[PDB]
Design a protein around this ligand. Structure first.
Ligand SMILES: *[C@@H]1O[C@H](CO)[C@@H](O[C@@H]2O[C@H](CO)[C@@H](O[C@@H]3O[C@H](CO[C@H]4O[C@H](CO)[C@@H](O)[C@H](O)[C@@H]4O)[C@@H](O)[C@H](O[C@H]4O[C@H](CO)[C@@H](O)[C@H](O)[C@@H]4O)[C@@H]3O)[C@H](O)[C@H]2NC(C)=O)[C@H](O)[C@H]1NC(C)=O
Ligand SMILES: CC(C)CN(CCc1ccc(Cl)c(Cl)c1)C[C@H](O)COc1ccc(NS(C)(=O)=O)cc1
Ligand SMILES: *[C@@H]1O[C@H](CO)[C@@H](O)[C@H](O)[C@H]1NC(C)=O
Ligand SMILES: *[C@@H]1O[C@H](CO)[C@@H](O)[C@H](O)[C@H]1NC(C)=O
Ligand SMILES: *[C@@H]1O[C@H](CO)[C@@H](O)[C@H](O)[C@H]1NC(C)=O
Ligand SMILES: [Cl-]
Ligand SMILES: [Cl-]
Ligand SMILES: [Cl-]
Ligand SMILES: [Cl-]
Ligand SMILES: [Cl-]
Ligand code: NA
Lengths: 358, 363
């Protein structure tokens, strides 16, 4: 009789709970499980953050979960309450689909990995594009929130230690008339513009930029995924280039990959000595899981090369490395794939890019 | 005059009786509104116990605000309380213990306020101590515990803006979210030369950092460590690994007793509600539950905050910072002596430091 080791999940639907179950079942078939054997314990998102925190205690930690997978729900409800409660005990949380950069902050989320990259990591792709198409002078426009500044930090790290940013402009999130900011950009000789902004803020930029005739020939616009989604698409200038994280929204793919990684890490953990069990339930328990920090190190340095979403590794912040993006180009108002970033390399496909103007 | 409900929550053994009796200034409100105080006892300080307890209160009674005291060294209690405060938009005062341990970066819509000094005030107290004794050469060690940036930045901002001959030699950042089987933190600490080391972390984190620091010879004579209030924590609990000669800034009821704190907490919440009622002819309706907060959110706000931070009562300014700390706390500088007892060796009052010793005796 093997030792039962529970994995937790908070997931969007019962369909995905069943997928979690079957993934754990496959992990048990795949692995040698005479000594340790995984058990799936799962729950769907609660309708508010307090209920969610409580459920983590009542439904998951009461089963002594070694780790908790967490999907971002579609249709105000973030992983945060799960990260907080799990973090209390140093139980690792694995984000499946959350892209916000704030979850890379160790002070706030001190046992959090994710199998998708933060939006800010789109700068990695921008940078390779800037080499490829030899844009050596760019203007960077970012929203003055955490996400915008995260993108700036990331690009400037890549640049400031080739191509250079000739200026960086920040604007206040929710500003509608951005003519002041964009005239400042119009002044400069660089005509490659990179944008980090939310859907609605990108809309505002696009509109103003059009009024100032900065969306026509000679200009290049380079953005990420948010800035060609929903309403942002509606007013985006033609010839724009943006990104889509491949499988970024496929909860089933990421459940499958995350379970594989966690299963591997669990079996690796139990090769070592003096592994303690997590606390059983929240009530009465205020000490951390002593082995939590060790398990985190093991997860952090896990490699799963043959993942559904590609090559799974994690960086210093526990963020996904070797993520793959579709490179998208707005042509006659259709988003058309003109290539992919395959994790380390830009691969252009046979569809020709059309720039602003042409 | 109408009654507002205030829960006072007491974790761990407490003179409930001395507490009730200090609030006999209950004949003490000549305001538009009067408090209806209910002492609740609580035994546990995990997230579930704390959440369910306050939520049960809120649904079995109309709570305008919470006054919270505990007898633990658990800084996470502050975080849980901020979370609860923000989600339910209910004023919470953490007046003692873990609840009062610095919570940096409170939620935008938190109504959570703590007795005790800000991070930046403590940082500046530390530099005043150092300036007194001409300890101008020092290093910093922190973990990733929230505040550590505000700490380091405050030091750096102060010393870069001053003509005193500060030399900040080394700033270490210790990651204690990973295990230490590769002796990483040992190798980081080995890098320390300075005779003064400022340490920002939690009490439990310091317990480990000190153990390691000792192993590589950094806690003896020649090295003086200075820590903030939350490391010393409860001064009747002194971990064996804490080095004698440890200096702390402290706030742990030396002259400000729990009874007096509970009285002031009740007063702050009550004055604040009276002030709002007098100006807007309403106050915020106590939340009927935690379990319906998603619905009721357009109907709720942190309006009451602007009054909560600007209370004077019985002649004393009980202002909070908007960052959620007491504005003018009387701080006590303390020293861990040869008998492993924490010992008063200075006061910080009126932005002025008064130290006991001109020269530090051996301990
Ligand atoms: C994203 O796309 C990139 C680029 O296509 C991929 O990286 C390449 O992966 C391929 C494997 O398919 C590697 O190909 C191998 O190259 C070896 C020599 O590499 C040197 O020379 C190249 C070219 O100048 C340099 O880029 C590289 O840095 C090295 O200096 C060959 O020796 C290999 O041949 C061996 O295997 C083949 C089997 O196909 C046998 O036929 C041969 O006999 C021999 O045993 C092979 O050709 C290539 O090196 C990689 N390039 C780089 C730059 O790393 C990524 O794999 C891809 N990522 C994903 C997730 O798909
Ligand atoms: C500061 C806020 C914004 C985030 N904290 C919230 C904590 C929290 C909140 C609500 C609940 Cl309901 C719970 Cl349960 C826990 C997270 C928590 O405060 C992280 O605590 C830490 C972080 C780092 C370290 N240092 S380290 C990474 O070296 O080990 C220590 C404690
Ligand atoms: C999501 O990934 C799964 C593999 O886990 C795959 O079967 C499915 O086709 C994917 N869905 C989409 C829309 O690509
Ligand atoms: C706390 O414990 C005491 C005695 O052990 C008991 O009388 C009291 O009911 C407990 N309180 C709660 C809330 O369980
Ligand atoms: C509120 O703050 C103001 C400062 O603008 C000051 O008049 C006083 O301290 C407070 N008002 C009161 C307590 O009525
Ligand atoms: Cl529980
Ligand atoms: Cl192409
Ligand atoms: Cl209890
Ligand atoms: Cl919150
Ligand atoms: Cl503190
Ligand atoms: Na992380």
């Amino acid at each position: 009789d093997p030792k039962i080791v529970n994995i937790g999940a908070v997931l969007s639907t019962k369909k995905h709970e069943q997928i979690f179950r079957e993934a754990v079942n496959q992990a048990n078939k795949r692995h040698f499980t005479r000594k340790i054997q995984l058990q799936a314990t799962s729950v769907t998102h609660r309708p508010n953050a307090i209920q969610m925190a409580l459920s983590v205690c009542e439904d998951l930690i009461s089963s002594q979960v070694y780790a908790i997978l967490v999907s971002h729900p579609p249709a105000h409800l973030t992983p945060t309450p799960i990260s907080y409660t799990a973090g209390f005990y140093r139980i690792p949380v694995i984000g499946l689909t959350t892209r916000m950069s704030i979850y890379s902050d160790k002070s706030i989320h001190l046992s959090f990995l994710r199998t998708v990259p933060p939006y800010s990591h789109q700068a990695l792709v921008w940078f390779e594009m800037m080499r490829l198409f030899n844009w050596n002078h760019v203007i960077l426009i970012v929203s003055d929130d955490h996400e915008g500044r995260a993108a700036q930090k990331k690009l400037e790290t890549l640049l400031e230690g080739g191509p250079k940013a000739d200026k960086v402009l920040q604007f206040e999130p929710g500003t509608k008339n951005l003519t002041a900011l964009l005239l400042e950009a119009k002044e400069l000789e660089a005509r490659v513009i990179i944008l980090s902004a939310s859907e609605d803020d990108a809309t505002a930029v696009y509109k103003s930029a059009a009024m100032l005739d900065m969306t026509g020939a000679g200009y290049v616009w380079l953005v990420g995924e948010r800035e060609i989604s929903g309403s942002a698409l509606r007013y985006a200038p033609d010839g724009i280039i943006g990104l889509q994280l491949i499988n970024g929204k496929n909860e089933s793919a990421h459940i499958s990959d995350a379970v594989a990684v966690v299963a591997q890490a669990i079996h690796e953990l139990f090769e070592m000595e003096n592994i303690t069990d997590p606390p059983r339930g929240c009530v009465g328990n205020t000490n951390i899981w002593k082995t939590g920090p060790l398990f985190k190190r093991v997860l952090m340095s896990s490699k799963y090369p043959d993942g559904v979403t590609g090559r799974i590794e994690f960086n210093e912040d526990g963020d996904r490395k070797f993520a793959q993006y579709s490179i998208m180009n707005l042509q006659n108002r259709k988003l058309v794939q003109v290539g992919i970033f395959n994790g380390s390399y830009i691969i252009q496909n046979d569809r020709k890019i059309i720039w602003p103007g042409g | 005059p109408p009654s507002i409900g205030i829960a006072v929550i007491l974790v761990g053994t407490s003179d409930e009786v001395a507490i009730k009796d200090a609030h006999e200034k209950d004949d003490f409100h000549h305001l538009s509104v009067v408090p209806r105080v209910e002492l609740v006892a609580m035994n546990e300080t995990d997230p579930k116990s704390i959440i369910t307890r306050i939520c049960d209160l809120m649904s079995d009674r109309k709570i305008q605000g919470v006054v919270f005291a505990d007898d633990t060294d658990q800084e996470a209690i502050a975080q849980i309380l901020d979370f609860i405060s923000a989600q339910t938009l209910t004023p919470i005062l953490g007046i003692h213990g873990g609840s009062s341990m610095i919570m940096a970066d409170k939620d935008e819509s938190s109504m959570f306020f703590q007795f005790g000094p800000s991070i930046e005030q403590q940082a500046s107290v530390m530099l005043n101590i150092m300036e007194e004794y001409d300890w101008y050469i020092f290093s910093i060690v922190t973990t990733y515990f929230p505040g550590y940036q505000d700490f380091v930045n405050k030091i750096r901002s102060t010393i870069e803006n001053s003509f005193v001959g500060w030399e900040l030699e080394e700033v270490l950042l210790l990651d204690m979210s990973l295990d230490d089987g590769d002796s990483k933190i040992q190798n980081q600490l080995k890098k320390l030369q300075s005779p003064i080391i400022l340490l920002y972390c939690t009490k439990e984190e310091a317990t480990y950092i000190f153990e390691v620091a000792n192993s590589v010879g950094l806690t003896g004579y020649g090295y003086t460590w200075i820590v903030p209030s939350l490391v010393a924590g409860d001064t009747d609990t002194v971990p064996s690994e804490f080095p004698t000669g440890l200096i702390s800034v402290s706030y742990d009821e030396w002259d400000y007793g729990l009874p007096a704190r509970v009285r002031d907490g009740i007063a702050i919440i009550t004055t604040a509600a009276s002030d709002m009622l007098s100006e807007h002819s309403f106050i915020p309706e106590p939340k009927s539950s935690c379990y319906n907060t998603h619905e009721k959110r357009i109907y709720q706000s942190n309006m009451l905050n602007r009054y909560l931070i600007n209370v004077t009562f019985e002649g004393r300014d009980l202002s909070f910072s908007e960052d959620g700390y007491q504005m003018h706390p009387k701080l006590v500088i303390i020293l861990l002596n040869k008998e492993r007892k924490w010992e008063r060796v200075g006061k910080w009052k009126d932005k002025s430091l008064q130290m006991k010793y001109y020269v530090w005796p051996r301990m």
